[PDB]
Amino acid sequence: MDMPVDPNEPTYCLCHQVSYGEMIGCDDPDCSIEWFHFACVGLTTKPRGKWFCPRCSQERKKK
Ligand SMILES: [Zn+2]
Ligand SMILES: [Zn+2]
Numbered sequence: 001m002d003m004p005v006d007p008n009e010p011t012y013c014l015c016h017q018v019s020y021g022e023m024i025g026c027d028d029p030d031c032s033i034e035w036f037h038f039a040c041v042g043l044t045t046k047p048r049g050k051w052f053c054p055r056c057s058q059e060r061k062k063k
Contacts (some may be wrong), residue, residue: 012033012034012036013033013035013036013037013040014036014040015037015039015040018035020037021037021038021039022038023035023036023037023038024037024038024040024041024043024047024051026051026052026053026056027050027051027052028052028056031056033053036053040053040054041053041054
């Protein structure tokens with residue numbers, strides 16, 4: 001029993017729920033969502049030490 005309330009806006013992914021499987025997050029420190037599931041992009045694996053969500057990456061579709 002701990003039930004915190006400090007985040008006035010909990011959950012953020014396209015799944016709107018956290019603490020399930022593994023996690024990522026768009027490396028943009030101004031991302032309005034911050035974290036994303038390894039299946040909110042269908043990653044299944046670690047991409048690199050730099051990633052972007054399917055909205056941050058859409059701004060530079062260059063392959
Ligand atoms: Zn998700
Ligand atoms: Zn993002």
